[PDB]
Amino acid sequence: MLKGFTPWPDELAETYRKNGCWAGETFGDLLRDRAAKYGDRIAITCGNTHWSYRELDTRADRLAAGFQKLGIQQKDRVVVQLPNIKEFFEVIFALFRLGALPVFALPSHRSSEITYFCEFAEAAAYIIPDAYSGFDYRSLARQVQSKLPTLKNIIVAGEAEEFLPLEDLHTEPVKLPEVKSSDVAFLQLSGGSTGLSKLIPRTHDDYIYSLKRSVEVCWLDHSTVYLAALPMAHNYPLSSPGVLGVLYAGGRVVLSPSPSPDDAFPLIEREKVTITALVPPLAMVWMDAASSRRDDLSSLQVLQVGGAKFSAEAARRVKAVFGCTLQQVFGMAEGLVNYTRLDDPEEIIVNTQGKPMSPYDESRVWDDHDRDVKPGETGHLLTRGPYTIRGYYKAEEHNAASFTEDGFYRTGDIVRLTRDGYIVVEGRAKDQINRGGEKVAAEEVENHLLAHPAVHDAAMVSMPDQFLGERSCVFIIPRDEAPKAAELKAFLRERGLAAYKIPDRVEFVESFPQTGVGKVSKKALREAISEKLLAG
Ligand SMILES: Nc1ncnc2c1ncn2[C@@H]1O[C@H](COP(=O)(O)O)[C@@H](O)[C@H]1O
Ligand SMILES: O=C(O)c1cccc(O)c1O
16 A cells, blocks of 8 residues: 555445456556567657567566666656657656656656655656757756755656766666556646646556556557657546557557647658547647648548547537547546547537546536536536546545545536536636626637637636626637737627627737646636736
8 A cells, every 4th residue: 555545445446356447467467468469569659760569578677677776666756757758668667567656747847846746756766858849857857956955866868967867777677576456556647727736646457447448449459550749648648548558459659759730740641640639729730730731641540639628610620621530538637538439420529528438437417516417417527437536645635625425536627418428518617707697618609719710729718807706808819810809709799699708808819828738728828817907
């Protein structure tokens, strides 16, 4: 038992293991296994380089030793902040075999966060690249050390300068400690904003299950060719199905330099990728490029889009722009992940956010009083299952206000279950606009606006107002020449939109504040408009 970990109920645990949900295998067993059923069947691609499963397997073994000689022991936490590169793999499976626990930080993090990540998780090691996307991470490290003189095992992929050169750790394999299929395998990082993040303990059993399923639902096989276009450490592109899921199904993963259609498209054409995943904001740009940039993306088959609702106005265009099957994906690091099945109608794909991936996923839409709302109603989404946590790392306070007494985790999202179980998300309860004592589902108004020839993307945020409590302020990224706020409102009015849903204010910008994985940060936008307001 890892300090801070909250297990599932004894009786419900057995259920899962007995119901073949928990395989009883580790990531060690996983890699050991696959690496031996198809040896040099390419597993990872970066530029011109290639890494056989078997190769990955080896390096892992070797690195594990080097890591162990470094002094890292079972259960030790090791924050890992690497971009989309081959090392990320050897590095995490090596820790997985050592029993160490990675802590998945994103490359966009900095001292404020990394110090917290290190201080909190009581990390025994920090892993970074010499530099990426123009940001030298050793300077960041130097920053963290300054605050954490104790952090003494800084490791670096590429020119390691004064710290520890990741390349020199590999050494002779050795006997490693028994890792139990039920041990916490790593610690993930909770959603973007509300402030500081929460850590998310996952275990070989609960996670790998979330992989085998996703694979089955996404149809991943040896033919699979996934293009990691988002920071892969993020749950979404790490397991839904993500790079790890891909490994599971003996397929091959292609690491892209950045999310830009500039790095991905040529890469898509060249490596002939068949599935990739974008968040909504990035999805718009991908589209815009998929015309104003002819170049063969025909290889593509499935194009995942999650992290936030993919407004109907845009989803409907996948088939036409990328000539493939769109897949809504509404998941979370806490567990539950919903997928529009590659089967079901075009409509279901274009107007819902899917339905749970596991038969054992339980989801209840309660109302402000934890009173199950009526059928098909809109309400607070709670969930519970095989790959859904029962508590955050060391956080008794948050856990009290996030997990019901019976294990249910409230996801803060507001949704309505449909006929077939499929979930149609409205948005985050805290993203709701309580204007003049009226509920305003932002997304709804946004979706309309995307339909305007001069709108590229849009994020409706609420803003203060002493008389109505809150007013509505929409941010618009012009699809060229910034339309007139009056023109947009008139547009909404013509479409028949309810007066109280029309944005009180329109604010034009070139891009929206985002987060680690790249989602728009409505929190951020809120701050923005609130400052402007104060400016007066
Ligand atoms: N497909 C989606 N549609 C609507 N909201 C989503 C979707 N995917 C992810 N999310 C949001 O992202 C959360 C999970 O992690 P985070 O973004 O870190 O708070 C969910 O609870 C949602 O609030
Ligand atoms: O983190 C998320 O919000 C997320 C989005 C899509 C799919 C996932 O698995 C996720 O964890």
